[PDB]
């Protein structure tokens, strides 16, 4: 530990997290509008400056450990759900959202955030623009698109485009009243998905950088991977697909420097 080297991708840009969290109109549980965020440095101070979360609980990572780690693919999914069923977005849970509106895969490494949104996402006549599904042919698969709303019949008699008893209307749209209790008030929710291995990061926290010193014992940090050791010039060839290597022992042994594309060893 003679020094402390930390190198992250040199690219920098304010992430579109601000416009993701501040959109004037969010999508429904009917269609989770998933938009890609990449090629920017991720800063969570704007998220903290945003409205106080009613429930910010995050899996596979901790909000303290959130800033240093570099995420490869971040995907902000937005939707509006009933305050009663806020706890249902957690994986391993069942509920109307879970059965038919949308699923979260059990092995989820991301953040879910919700905040009371009757402040401005409620109209006295109700926000019927937001809709949900009572009925579906089966259980919806995790992270699977569902954008079709065709007339469904519970009974054996086919509908043939005709609605009636045992053949209920396809989607139900809830109109939030300001008078509705906190349980029934609308909630704006944002869901983030992360991936940490075998991919280029292109999404990192603000940590600046310092050049490495070859053949010097350092406690390094590469793309959020914390390790200590001597950095040695290497001759083993890596294809563009893989960035950091692996040994028999399953710990890291090789890495390609983000700023200068060149493969380094992680020998002790």
């Amino acid at each position, epitope marked *: 530990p003679t020094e402390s080297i930390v190198r992250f991708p040199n690219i920098t840009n304010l992430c579109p997290f601000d416009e993701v969290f501040n959109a004037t109109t969010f999508a429904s549980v009917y269609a989770w509008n998933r938009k890609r965020i990449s090629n920017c440095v991720a800063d969570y101070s704007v998220l903290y400056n945003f409205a*106080p979360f009613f429930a910010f609980k995050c899996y596979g990572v901790s909000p303290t450990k959130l800033n240093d780690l570099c995420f490869t693919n971040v995907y902000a999914d937005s939707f509006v759900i009933r305050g009663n069923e806020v706890s249902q977005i957690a994986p391993g849970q069942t509920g109307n959202i879970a059965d038919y509106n949308y699923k979260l895969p059990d092995d989820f490494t991301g953040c879910v955030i919700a905040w*009371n949104s*009757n*402040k*401005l996402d*409620s*109209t*006295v*006549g*109700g926000n019927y623009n937001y809709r949900y599904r009572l009925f579906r042919k089966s259980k919806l698969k995790p992270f699977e698109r569902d954008i079709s709303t065709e007339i469904y019949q519970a009974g054996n008699k086919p509908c043939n485009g005709v609605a009636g008893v045992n053949c209920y209307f396809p989607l139900q749209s809830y109109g939030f*009243r*300001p*008078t*509705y*209790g*906190v*349980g029934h*008030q609308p909630y704006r929710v944002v869901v983030l998905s992360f991936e940490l291995l075998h991919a280029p990061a292109t999404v990192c926290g603000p940590k600046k950088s310092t050049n490495l010193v070859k053949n010097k014992c350092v406690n390094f940090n590469f793309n959020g991977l914390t390790g200590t050791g001597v950095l040695t010039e290497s001759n083993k060839k890596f294809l563009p697909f893989q960035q950091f290597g692996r040994d028999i022992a399953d710990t890291t042994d090789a890495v390609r420097d983000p700023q200068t594309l060149e493969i380094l060893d992680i020998t002790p």
Partner: antibody
Amino acid sequence: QVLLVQSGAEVKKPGASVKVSCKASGYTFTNNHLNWLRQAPGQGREWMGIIDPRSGGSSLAQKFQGRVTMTSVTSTNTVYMEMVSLKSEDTAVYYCARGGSKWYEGFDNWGQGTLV
Amino acid sequence: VLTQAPSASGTPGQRATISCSGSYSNIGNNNVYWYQQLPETAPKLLIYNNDQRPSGVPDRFSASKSGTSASLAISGLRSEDEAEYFCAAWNNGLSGSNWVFGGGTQL
């Protein structure tokens, strides 16, 4: 100047239906909301509910939901209330309140009220 | 639910304040706005969005909130102007959400 029409004072009769109107002035009717709260002497103040001017929709407090009906009409520039099974306790003074959007919780004008 | 508020007696040429007592759901999260009233007179808006007075209200007055308590200060309160005041905050608690007004003690 913003002016709100006050319905005249009315005799209170148990088991009767009354209507009260508040006609807007000093502003365009549809742009800004109008909601209602009442005062009972010897007690605190309480809020009826809010009606949308442009859409005409009404949202009413659960505490007194169902006893009162509110309908907003463009030409009338006013909203009506209904009273079903008027009990002697419920008779009181009722104020109209005018404000902006829903998040603009602050009411910027006031109603004269009805008292006998 | 309603703010308890204290009781006051005016003293000429003296700054006076009115404080409200509410829950976290009543006043902590939702901003408050004040309403100065005099007998045989209609209500009047006093402060707007919990931090500033509306346009046209005299600038001598200042008000602020500290959690459950919001202090409405009157610059050199006069006994003739002195009257009971009352908070006006939005409540959203359990199955019910509504505007809650805590009538202060008679002044």
